[PDB]
Design an enzyme around this catalytic site. Sequence first.
Site, mmCIF file in Angstrom:
data_model
loop_
_atom_site.group_PDB
_atom_site.id
_atom_site.type_symbol
_atom_site.label_atom_id
_atom_site.label_comp_id
_atom_site.label_asym_id
_atom_site.label_seq_id
_atom_site.Cartn_x
_atom_site.Cartn_y
_atom_site.Cartn_z
ATOM 1 N N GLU A 1 0.848 -1.180 0.000
ATOM 2 C CA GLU A 1 0.000 0.000 0.000
ATOM 3 C C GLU A 1 0.890 1.238 0.000
ATOM 4 O OE1 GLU A 1 -2.436 0.295 3.476
ATOM 5 O OE2 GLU A 1 -4.311 0.204 2.349
ATOM 6 N N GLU B 1 -9.703 10.403 3.498
ATOM 7 C CA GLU B 1 -9.768 9.439 4.588
ATOM 8 C C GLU B 1 -10.187 10.156 5.861
ATOM 9 O OE1 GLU B 1 -7.125 6.258 4.659
ATOM 10 O OE2 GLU B 1 -6.560 6.395 2.548
#
Length: 221
Positions: A99, A201
Amino acid sequence: MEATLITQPHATGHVGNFFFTHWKDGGSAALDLDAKGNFSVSWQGGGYNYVGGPGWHFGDKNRVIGYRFNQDSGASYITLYGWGYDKSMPATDPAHLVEYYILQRWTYDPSQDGIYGKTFVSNGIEYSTYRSIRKVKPSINGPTTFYQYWSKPSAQQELGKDHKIIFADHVKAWADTGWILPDMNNFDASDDPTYQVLAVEVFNPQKNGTASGQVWDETPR
């Protein structure tokens, strides 16, 4: 003109050429996205978590990502966000699945859990690299143990102005410390493609909020 409004708990797909991912564990958070790359994420105060944003279903070492944000009430962080995955590597090697994040704005610094790599300049902006390890956590390939690569600028990228993320500079800076990205252009993983998005986020927000802007591919030629 084509546009979508994503309100279900989780969804991926395309609006024209723009891939999107959208995830929440509850609440009324919603992703608005049109075919010109204009988008908006609005979230609800409470114990909800949200990750979502537009981009492409594949990463590209040479991509330059342009964007502007016209509003950010205070997302936990706004970041370029993507994956690589090499199905041929052993799953016990955390570099088999990675990631990656190129932070741009944040109220919480998610790289504070990582180890420091190096500092470099990209597009006149100073970035520092970090690596963290996620043990048996969710992924595009199900629960597994994988690395996270971070790139954090020395200052927040401001609203109302166009910005560039020269992805190749970050790939190289991670590679400079041995942090190698596996293949970023495949559907080999079980759950998702190796996508690359500009993600909003929001983790346990104290208040309602909105982050909105536009994303585009700015790769020169």
